[PDB]
């Protein structure tokens, strides 16, 4: 094997420069159909909304879906229009590229494929809302948002 195995995971918001902040993480959190996915603490009113089924397609890309499966419709990380600072919404699951962060066994940049040359769209957070952050592929080694995937 290689890459992340299929399963149910919690996703904690970190960065490439600080992949392991310590206790007190903010986790991807569903908050209703077609609503923005948020970054919230692992606390009583949210825990059930913080587990995600991650699956790799024959493509090598992954969907991140809310709560296993079996409802009328599968909801997961998605986007209406992919634009800078647009929110990640719980919608028809989109496909993503997961890039393992150097020095870590389990932190990945969640990348949303787009046309644009020399541009990388990555899932980040702005005020506790997950959003698409656009970065130049500049070779700078600059800070990028990333996510620690821990098995549930």
UniProtKB/Swiss-Prot annotation:
Official protein name in the record: Clitocypin-2
Database matches in InterPro entries: Prot_inh_I48_clitocypin
MF terms in GO: cysteine-type endopeptidase inhibitor activity
Complexes and interactors: Homodimer.
Family: Belongs to the protease inhibitor I48 family.
Tissue-wise expression: Expressed in all analyzed tissues, but expression was higher in the pileus and in the lower part of the stipe.
The species this protein was found in: Clitocybe nebularis (Clouded agaric)
Keywords, ordered alphabetically: Protease inhibitor, Thiol protease inhibitor
Top-rank lineage group of the source organism: Eukaryota
Presence of keyword RNA-binding: no
Effect of substituting residue 70 to K: No inhibition of asparaginyl endopeptidase
Functional summary from the UniProt entry: Binds and inhibits cysteine proteinases. Inhibits most strongly papain and cathepsin L, more weakly bromelain and cathepsin B while it is completely ineffective against cathepsin H.
